[PDB]
Design a protein around this nucleic acid. Structure first.
Ligand SMILES: [Mg+2]
Ligand SMILES: [Mg+2]
Ligand SMILES: [Mg+2]
Ligand SMILES: [Mg+2]
Ligand SMILES: [Mg+2]
Ligand SMILES: [Mg+2]
Ligand SMILES: [Mg+2]
Ligand SMILES: [Mg+2]
Ligand SMILES: [Mg+2]
Ligand SMILES: [Mg+2]
Ligand SMILES: [Mg+2]
Ligand SMILES: [Mg+2]
Ligand SMILES: [Mg+2]
Ligand SMILES: [Mg+2]
Ligand SMILES: [Mg+2]
Ligand SMILES: [Mg+2]
Ligand SMILES: [Mg+2]
Ligand SMILES: [Mg+2]
Ligand SMILES: [Mg+2]
Ligand SMILES: [Mg+2]
Ligand SMILES: [Mg+2]
Ligand SMILES: [Mg+2]
Ligand SMILES: [Mg+2]
Ligand SMILES: [Mg+2]
Ligand SMILES: [Mg+2]
Ligand SMILES: [Mg+2]
Ligand SMILES: [Mg+2]
Ligand SMILES: [Mg+2]
Ligand SMILES: [Mg+2]
Ligand SMILES: [Mg+2]
Ligand SMILES: [Mg+2]
Ligand SMILES: [Mg+2]
Ligand SMILES: [Mg+2]
Ligand SMILES: [Zn+2]
Lengths: 58, 143, 36, 206, 172
RNA sequence: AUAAACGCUGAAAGCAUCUAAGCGUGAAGCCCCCCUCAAGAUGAGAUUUCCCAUUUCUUCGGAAAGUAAGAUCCCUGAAAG
RNA sequence: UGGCACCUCGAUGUCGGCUCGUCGCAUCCUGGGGCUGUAGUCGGUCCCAAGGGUUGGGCUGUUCGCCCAUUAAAGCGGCACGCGAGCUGGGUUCAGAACGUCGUGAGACAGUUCGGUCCCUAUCCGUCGCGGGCGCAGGAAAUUUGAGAGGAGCUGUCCUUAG
């Protein structure tokens, strides 16, 4: 799951490390299993979550 | 339960051409090995092949920092007594750049049947001309 | 040529240099040539 | 650089004009023709293909019969190639005669050795026997197979096997006399192979 | 201290193209490359060079660039030559057109041909000169000529320059 | 192309210096040259020539059943074993 | 040469020689050099170099060592002191007998002397040769490129240059 999430998040100009930090800092508590599922077959929702994580970091 | 596992032929495999002018040998090989393995896709399944095909041109201008062009040695043994042979890295870059790149990249792939299948997807040319124009490869930029 | 671990000048006109990354002395007296 | 193909006829001797007596081997080189020409634009290397003996159409098949018909001749029994040769000569279908050589040239002979069967290590590799008295029980045996530490036996540990029958070339070997009408070639010394073997004669490399 | 102030005497054509350089005088054409990290200055009759980095890996290059520009300028203007003399019985020298022969006590004559840009002339059987318009080639050709039979300390016989103090011994 | 070594030009370090940038010589040794094996080199290569596009069934995929070029069974043998 | 006592006592055969080698370089010869208290011929010492080469006998079971005659040279070491399901069995280390010496004695002595059973049909890997099968996107006949690998690699004397 971690490898899959990292691959899907590098296309948004983000590491796995930065994305996980932003998700924790934003308050979202979705585990790696559901995030990998979204990365595989709901990429739009994954991009939405990644945008929220980007907002949290800055 | 419910976790996506890919199937053979289910993922598209594309073609890339990478210019190796001035890049360090290992720093190019790491990126190429990651591309071949298929680790840049959210479809990555460890037990099958989802990676891409790679064409490397201008392998004769690959970079070697320090005194590696003369002080790095490549060894072979024929399994006959006293049959060890040596070769320096600058000599191979001058004469067989393709084999230098192939050794470097092959050392970075998994050492099993799948790794042996992945190695067959790499084409290395010492010049700037390749014969795979029928596959319509794209340009890949490093990093 | 003297190959020693203890290269050092032997008279008042010896000279110490470095060639290919190793210390050696040169003199107009050939008996004084040394290298590590 | 020149070259022909021929059969080893026999072995004899002749007297030179000086007075001395020398051994010679007789080679018959009749009926050899140029078949095909290999070029660097088509093959990657330059060579000439020569065929040696006419053979009955009963023994030849359609592929090789078409190949030889492409040069307007009858099927051949031996076909070989020569490199390092000038392609300006050798028109396709032209014949090669023994007079390409002259008395005094230095040549090379290439052929397949006489066959010795399953031979032991003393005939095959020229080993040494063990003592054959003083109580010894070791006469024509190979030897020690190696030390103990490797837990194995190395490669090139010479052992019994099939002895003869390989390709051998022996070089810098003078020519004595050429007879154009009888298509023979008297050349001084030995050549590998039994009688009726194929011998490939060509100009010395060095 | 000091490695500056190149002065072009006269009739010397000097041009700069990228990292290269190009010098022409009355003698011949000399072209060679230089590192881009050095700075080259050109005007009508003066040449100057400066080192922006000012560290060990750059001061030496500044100095050598100044030195070899001076060498190229002076070579085409005034020229370079070296002096060789042969000492000992039986050592002669003859010129076969553009070819040099030496008899230095061997069982076969040794032949030297002057390459392009240099001229070998022999005023007398026991003394030779090499001419040219660059220091490197003239010096190397003279060194190769001397290396056939270098001087020996016991009697002094051999080929040598005009200005070295070859050591002498006794050897009773 | 190099090892030990010998040099040319040359600064750092107004001189000197075989080294730092750049050139040249230099071993029975290294890589070639010479002889042999070698495409199962699964990366299975190349050239020349020969045979051609049949009939039954199949849900396609595919199968069988007579052949062409060619080869073998069987027999006479040795230059081979 | 020793110290320890970690594996082996429901067995890991020991010295020398024979057959067969392979590796290290701290190089005996041959190749290339620096210094010399190197005139020449011959040497001394150090540096690079493992490609090839490196004898036949007398004495002793001998390794070793001395000697004879040669040679360009007669290198030093590792591999279970390489190699006994490859060989020998002279030595050591079984039962017989004798000497010197020790013991009252039966006996004993890294003291000597003469004689003394060396078993095995190769399963797996390994090595040397020779075949069958399938593969190599049609089925065949020949001729070949060469990635890669193996072999070879030694050296004297005489004449001339020139007394
Ligand atoms: Mg001292
Ligand atoms: Mg014997
Ligand atoms: Mg017997
Ligand atoms: Mg093992
Ligand atoms: Mg050279
Ligand atoms: Mg050579
Ligand atoms: Mg093929
Ligand atoms: Mg018969
Ligand atoms: Mg011990
Ligand atoms: Mg204890
Ligand atoms: Mg035990
Ligand atoms: Mg047991
Ligand atoms: Mg050494
Ligand atoms: Mg020597
Ligand atoms: Mg010497
Ligand atoms: Mg040896
Ligand atoms: Mg006797
Ligand atoms: Mg040994
Ligand atoms: Mg043992
Ligand atoms: Mg032993
Ligand atoms: Mg033994
Ligand atoms: Mg054994
Ligand atoms: Mg005994
Ligand atoms: Mg007893
Ligand atoms: Mg008593
Ligand atoms: Mg008896
Ligand atoms: Mg007896
Ligand atoms: Mg006994
Ligand atoms: Mg047996
Ligand atoms: Mg087969
Ligand atoms: Mg090869
Ligand atoms: Mg192989
Ligand atoms: Mg060999
Ligand atoms: Zn001094």
């Amino acid at each position: 799951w971690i490898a899959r999430i990292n691959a899907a998040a590098r296309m948004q100009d983000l590491s796995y490390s930065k994305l996980m930090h932003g998700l924790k800092l934003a308050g979202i508590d979705i585990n790696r299993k559901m995030l990998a599922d979204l990365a595989v077959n709901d990429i739009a929702s994954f991009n939405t979550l990644a945008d929220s994580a980007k907002k949290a970091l800055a | 339960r419910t976790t996506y596992m890919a199937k053979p032929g289910e993922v598209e495999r594309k073609w890339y051409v990478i210019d190796a002018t001035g890049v360090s040998l290992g720093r190019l090989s790491s990126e190429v090995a990651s591309i071949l393995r298929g680790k840049n896709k959210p479809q990555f399944t460890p037990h099958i092949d989802t990676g891409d095909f790679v064409i490397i041109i201008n392998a004769g201008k690959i970079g070697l920092t320090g005194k590696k062009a003369t002080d790095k040695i490549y060894y072979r043994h024929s399994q006959y007594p006293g049959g060890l042979k040596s070769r320096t890295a600058g000599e191979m870059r001058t004469n067989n750049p393709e084999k230098l790149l192939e050794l470097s990249i092959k050392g970075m792939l998994p050492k099993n049947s799948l790794g042996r299948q992945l190695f067959k997807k790499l084409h290395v040319y010492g010049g700037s001309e390749h014969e795979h124009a029928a596959q319509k490869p794209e340009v890949y930029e490093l990093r | 040529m003297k190959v020693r671990p203890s290269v050092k000048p032997m008279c008042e006109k010896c000279k110490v240099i470095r060639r290919k990354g190793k210390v050696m002395v040169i003199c107009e007296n050939p008996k004084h040539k040394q290298k590590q | 650089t020149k070259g022909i193909l021929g059969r080893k006829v026999g072995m004899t001797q002749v007297f030179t004009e000086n007075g001395e007596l020398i051994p010679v081997t007789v080679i018959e080189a009749a009926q050899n023709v140029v078949l095909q020409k290999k070029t660097v634009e088509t093959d990657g290397y330059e060579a000439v293909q020569i065929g040696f003996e006419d053979k009955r159409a009963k023994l030849s098949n359609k592929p090789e019969q078409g190949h030889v018909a492409k040069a307007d001749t009858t099927p051949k029994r031996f076909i070989r190639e020569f490199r390092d040769v000038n392609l300006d000569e050798y028109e396709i279908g032209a014949e090669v005669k023994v007079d390409v050589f002259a008395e005094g040239d230095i040549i090379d002979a290439t052929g397949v050795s006489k066959g010795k069967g399953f031979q032991g290590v003393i005939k095959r590799h020229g080993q040494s026997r063990g003592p054959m008295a003083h109580g010894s029980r070791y006469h024509r045996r190979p030897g020690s197979m190696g030390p103990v530490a490797p837990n194995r036996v190395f490669k090139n540990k010479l052992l019994p096997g099939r002895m003869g029958g390989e390709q051998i070339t022996i070089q810098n070997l003078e020519i004595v006399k050429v007879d154009v009408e009888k298509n023979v070639l008297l050349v001084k010394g030995n050549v590998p192979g039994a009688k009726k073997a194929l011998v490939q004669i060509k100009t010395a490399t060095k | 201290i000091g490695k500056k102030t190149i002065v072009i005497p006269a009739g010397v054509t000097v041009t700069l193209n990228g990292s290269t350089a190009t010098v022409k005088g009355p003698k011949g054409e000399l072209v060679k490359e230089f590192n881009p990290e050095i700075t080259i200055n050109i005007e009508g009759n003066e040449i100057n060079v400066s080192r922006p980095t000012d560290n060990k890996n750059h001061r030496a290059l500044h100095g050598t660039t100044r030195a070899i520009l001076n060498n190229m300028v002076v070579g085409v203007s005034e020229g370079y030559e070296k002096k060789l003399e042969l000492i000992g019985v039986g050592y002669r020298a003859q010129k076969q057109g553009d070819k040099l022969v030496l008899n230095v006590g061997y069982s076969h004559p040794v032949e030297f041909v002057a390459p392009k840009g240099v001229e070998i002339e022999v005023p007398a059987n026991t003394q030779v000169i090499v001419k040219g318009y660059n220091k490197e080639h003239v010096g190397e050709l003279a060194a190769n000529i001397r290396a056939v039979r270098p001087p020996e300390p016991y009697k002094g016989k051999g080929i040598r320059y005009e200005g070295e103090h070859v050591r002498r011994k006794e050897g009773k």
